[PDB]
């Protein structure tokens, strides 16, 4: 069950005392007209709550008057419960008959408490507290005698805009309107330029590790998905850089360099180890950034294999990336540390150069005749997208108007011409009779059509809606623009 | 980052089971995922990883044949699932400080609460 | 399968073969209190996470070294490495020692 709070639920916001005066204020307030939950039970707690009967618990306990958590002693019963930077307000205000009528609530307590209550139970209306404008109309004797909610209609926005509870006849501006995007797209030209990586991982001669092969990996984007998702991939591990965010970053160059060893020898291939090929064979630096792929090879090298050489000798150590001797000897059975393994180390270098080595770019659809925030290969903006029927020349990627503006792009992928306009915004002003005969307005939506605004009237001004167009011209009494006025007959014409 | 699996049940001796496992928590640093068993009065045996990204897995040689794990990547779990004891069932996700990734010395940090499986 | 004692009133040793302690892979350890799973004390040779405890590697042999008879931390701890035989790899649990 609900009902309509129809003039209540405000309050004095402040200790301040104003007289003859017209306030505008922002705080938490119960809106006008709102459904009011009606009991006859534990309700939420939010920003406040209204509460109005014909003890509390938040724990903050009220108890009919012994408030405790700290330690506090001291027809319609309508009340305003709300917390801000630790102190419990409560406003309270007893009146004789939710009614009609509006009446403020005067403070009853500020408790220094220093608790954030979500839920309560009382031991009967529950509304809610949000923040909104609002405008206080104040007597002399410093009582709010009436109220206005900025953001109930068109018709208490020109109040609030004209500071007054009265509004003489005319057309006034209170807002704006602006259409929001409702989807996002990026795109980019369809990457074909994918990294050599095959003669990498699917090669079939590989050097031994005592004088292992590299290669040189340039202008392309590195598929790195390809080979974390490996359906052979024994180890897989980056120092520096997380797998996962591969594709954000881009490199000046990549080197892969490849070479085989035993199985329970591929823990030495990392930062901060030592071993017989950590210092004989290859050095791998403490400062390295790149990753390290390695699986095992046993069915393309093992044979019923004195191929491979490493060394147990070598008179001084290896230094980084530096290329007696012993034949590894692989056999088809075996343990898991004594079969081959194939390693791939990809190292990652970056210096004062263009970055060339990137991952796959990824693109989304293409929008059409909608707001969206996009991005063509790189280039930002907002607004709708539609078909151009401009000429770019062929190396020509986006235009721009006379004052430097994006004005059309052209789709990476398959090359038509995108004109961008922006996304409608405007003034909204309402049109309004004096408050003295009516309170009913008609608004226009300055230079929007009237099919992208959410007894409608089109017009070269903008979008009326709320008043009906006749055939007949009268004499004008509220002008709109271009040729067209309004006035009140019994409704509102133009 | 949490883990979070499947409660206790009984089966009849001879069938099938289906433990699952969410990593809810994050699943930003995690690759793999293990499933581990520890008997009533028995300290923990390993049985199998799973890697999420490649959907490979190895096993413990003891159950081979008889064991199955699948990552489901859209909904970010582990399914370990047996054919044909009363073993206490844990799911652990895989973890390095010293890299990112997977591989043979990295431990098992983040388990989950243990699945018990019953005849 | 790593050799452990059987319970310890101090240290508790771990002892495997060149296979997969003296192999030169890290061993890790683990806390396991009665009613949940194991806790990690130590990763790779001795670093921990948030939350005493100390170790090392000799030969084919490791160990945990725990100071301080604190509280009744009556766990069962148990040491993990990786093993590099059998026809493929495994990760290889201690029998468990009771503190």
């Known amino acids: 069950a609900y009902t309509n709070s129809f003039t209540r639920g405000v309050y004095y916001p402040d200790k301040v005392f104003r007289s003859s005066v017209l306030h505008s204020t922002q705080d938490l307030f119960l809106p006008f007209f709102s459904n009011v939950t009606w009991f006859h039970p534990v309700l939420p707690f939010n920003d406040g709550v209204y509460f109005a009967s014909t003890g509390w618990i938040f724990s903050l306990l009220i108890v009919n008057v012994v408030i405790k958590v700290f330690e506090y002693v001291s027809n319609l019963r309508e009340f305003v419960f709300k917390n801000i930077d630790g102190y419990f307000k409560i406003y309270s205000k007893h009146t004789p008959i939710l009614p009609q009528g509006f009446s403020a609530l005067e403070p009853l307590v500020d408790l220094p408490i220093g608790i954030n209550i979500t839920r309560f139970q009382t031991l009967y209306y529950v509304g809610y507290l949000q923040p909104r404008t609002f405008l206080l109309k104040y007597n002399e004797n410093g009582t709010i005698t009436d109220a206005v909610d900025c953001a109930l209609d068109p018709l208490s926005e020109t109040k609030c805009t004209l500071k007054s509870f009265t509004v003489e006849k005319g057309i006034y501006q209170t807002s704006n309107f602006r259409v929001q995007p409702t989807e996002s797209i990026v795109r980019f030209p369809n990457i074909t330029n994918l990294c050599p990586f095959g003669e990498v991982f699917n090669a079939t001669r590989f050097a031994s590790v005592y004088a292992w092969n590299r290669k040189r990996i340039s202008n392309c984007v590195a598929d790195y998905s390809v080979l974390y998702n490996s359906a052979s991939f024994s180890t897989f591990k980056c120092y520096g850089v997380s797998p996962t965010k591969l594709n954000d970053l881009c490199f000046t160059n990549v080197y892969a360099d490849s070479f085989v060893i035993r199985g329970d020898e591929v823990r030495q291939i990392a930062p901060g180890q030592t071993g017989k090929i950590a210092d004989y064979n290859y050095k791998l630096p403490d400062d390295f950034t790149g990753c390290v792929i390695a699986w095992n090879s046993n069915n393309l090298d093992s044979k019923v294999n004195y191929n491979y050489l490493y060394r147990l000798f070598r008179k001084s150590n290896l230094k980084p990336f530096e290329r007696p001797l012993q034949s590894y000897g692989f056999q088809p059975t075996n343990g898991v540390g004594y079969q081959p393994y194939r390693v791939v180390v990809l190292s990652f270098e970056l210096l004062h150069a263009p970055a060339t080595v990137c991952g796959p770019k990824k693109s989304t659809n293409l929008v059409k005749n909608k707001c969206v925030n996009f991005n063509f290969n790189g280039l930002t903006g907002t607004g709708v997208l539609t078909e151009s029927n401009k000429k770019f020349l062929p190396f020509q990627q986006f235009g721009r108007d006379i004052a430097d503006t994006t004005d059309a792009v052209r789709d990476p992928q398959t090359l038509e011409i995108l004109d961008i306009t922006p996304c409608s915004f405007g003034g909204v002003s309402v049109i309004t009779p004096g408050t003295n005969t009516s309170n009913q307005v008609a608004v226009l939506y300055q230079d929007v059509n009237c099919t992208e605004v959410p007894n409608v009237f089109q017009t070269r001004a903008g979008c009326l809606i709320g008043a009906e167009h006749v055939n007949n011209s009268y004499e004008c009494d509220i002008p709109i623009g271009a040729g067209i006025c309004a006035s009140y007959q019994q409704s509102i014409i133009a | 980052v949490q883990l979070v699996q499947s409660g206790a049940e009984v089966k009849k001796p001879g069938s099938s089971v289906k433990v699952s496992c969410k990593a809810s928590?994050?699943?930003?640093?995690?690759?793999?995922i293990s499933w581990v068993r520890q008997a009533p009065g028995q300290g923990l045996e390993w049985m199998g990883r799973?890697?999420?990204?490649?959907?490979?897995?190895n096993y413990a040689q003891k159950i081979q044949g008889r064991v199955t794990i699948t990552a489901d990547k859209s909904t970010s779990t582990a399914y370990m699932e047996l054919t044909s004891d009363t073993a206490v069932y844990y799911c652990?996700?895989?973890?390095?400080?010293?890299?990112?990734?997977?591989?043979?010395?990295?431990?098992?940090?983040?388990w989950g609460q243990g699945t018990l499986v019953t005849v | 399968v790593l050799t452990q004692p059987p319970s310890v009133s101090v240290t508790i040793s771990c002892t495997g073969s060149?296979?997969?302690?003296?192999?030169?892979?890290?061993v890790h350890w683990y806390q396991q209190l009665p009613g949940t799973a194991p806790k990690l004390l130590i990763c790779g040779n001795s670093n921990r996470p948030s939350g005493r405890f100390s170790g090392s590697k000799s030969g084919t042999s490791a160990s945990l070294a725990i100071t301080g008879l604190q509280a009744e931390d009556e766990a069962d701890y148990y040491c993990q490495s990786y093993d590099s035989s059998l026809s493929g790899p495994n990760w290889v649990f201690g029998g468990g020692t009771k503190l």
């Open positions: 652990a996700r895989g973890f390095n400080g010293n890299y990112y990734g997977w591989g043979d010395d990295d431990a098992f940090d983040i």
């Open positions: 928590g994050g699943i930003f640093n995690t690759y793999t």
């Open positions: 799973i890697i999420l990204m490649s959907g490979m897995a």
């Open positions: 060149n296979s997969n302690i003296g192999a030169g892979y890290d």
